[PDB]
Design a binder for this molecule. Structure first.
Ligand code: HEM
Length: 152
């Protein structure tokens, strides 16, 4: 649960991402894959990437980065009222993609890391706090749907 002040911070930070959604998306996925190589194995269409240079050079990775952050942004702009938007993602990721909730924790922290890296000194303590809470909320609501489905 976030206050409106906190949501304001979230959407303020998100403005940074929207100025370059493909660059942000790309770096988020790269941070995930290199930080946690087991995550790469969940992607049939990225599993061929061995090196970060191949990752960086991959237009399809940047494309998927755009898809992921576009979806996350749509969810964030709902300010918590995201049941309709979130349920199909929860379903596809539990039943089709088989993504454990741990990997959602991974990509959450990766987003935090990328924002600091691309906006050093421009991502303040209050902004980090708000973003972290938003991603926890996202993750927690997914987790509820995972439990429903009996998925680990
Ligand atoms: C902020 C977190 C995430 C968002 C917003 C997100 C969103 C999406 C969307 C919109 C799609 C395409 C439609 C669909 O299949 O439902 C997708 C596909 C997919 N996602 Fe996620 N996702 C997230 C996290 C993750 C993580 C952490 C993993 C694995 C470590 C993952 C693995 C996959 C895979 C394997 C596909 C299908 C890729 C393909 O073959 O095209 N996702 N995701």
């Amino acid at each position: 649960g976030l206050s409106d002040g906190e949501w304001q911070q979230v959407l303020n930070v998100w403005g940074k991402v929207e100025a370059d959604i493909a660059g942000h998306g790309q770096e988020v996925l790269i941070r995930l894959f290199t930080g946690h190589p087991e995550t790469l194995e969940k992607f049939d269409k990225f599993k061929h990437l061995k090196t970060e240079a191949e990752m960086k050079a991959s237009e399809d990775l940047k494309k998927h980065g755009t898809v992921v952050l576009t979806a996350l942004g749509g969810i964030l702009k709902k300010k918590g009222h995201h049941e309709a938007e979130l349920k199909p993602l929860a379903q596809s990721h539990a039943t089709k993609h088989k993504i454990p909730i741990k990997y959602l924790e991974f990509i959450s922290d990766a987003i935090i890391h990328v924002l600091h890296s691309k906006h050093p000194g421009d991502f303040g303590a209050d902004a980090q706090g708000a973003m972290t809470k938003a991603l926890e909320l996202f993750r927690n609501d997914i987790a509820a749907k995972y439990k429903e489905l009996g998925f680990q």
